[PDB]
Amino acid sequence: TLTGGASGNGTMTVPGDLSSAKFFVGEIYNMTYEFSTPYLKETPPGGGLAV
Amino acid sequence: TLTGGASGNGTMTVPGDLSSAKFFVGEIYNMTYEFSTPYLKETPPGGGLAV
Numbered sequence: 396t397l398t399g400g401a402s403g404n405g406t407m408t409v410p411g412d413l414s415s416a417k418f419f420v421g422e423i424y425n426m427t428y429e430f431s432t433p434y435l436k437e438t439p440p441g442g443g444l445a446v
Numbered sequence: 447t448l449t450g451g452a453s454g455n456g457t458m459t460v461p462g463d464l465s466s467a468k469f470f471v472g473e474i475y476n477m478t479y480e481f482s483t484p485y486l487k488e489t490p491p492g493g494g495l496a497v
Contacts, residue, residue, distance in 0.1 A: 436491055444492065 400406040407420075439445045451457040458471075490496045 438491070 396406045398405055434446050436444045436446055447457045449456055485497050487495050487497050
């Protein structure tokens with residue numbers, strides 16, 4: 396429930412008895428890493444790198 | 447014996463007769479060195495090292 400607890404605080408319901416357990420609470424956020432086009436690089440005659 | 451000698455000093459009993467020998471006395475301490483994971487390294491095209 397978004398709100399409705401004491402002083403307007405949010406409420407949550409979970410199975411089991413957690414009246415004496417130790418736990419965190421919070422949201423979840425995603426991570427994303429997109430690789431680039433794989434190529435080849437070799438040294439040109441003038442020096443440096445070319446693709 | 448942890449204590450009980452003269453002036454509360456510790457005592458130690460060893461076999462043999464050591465009334466005229468020359469000897470040290472003290473504790474012992476250990477030495478530990480743990481190697482890492484062995485790997486291979488080569489030179490990448492851009493210079494430097496990689497594993």
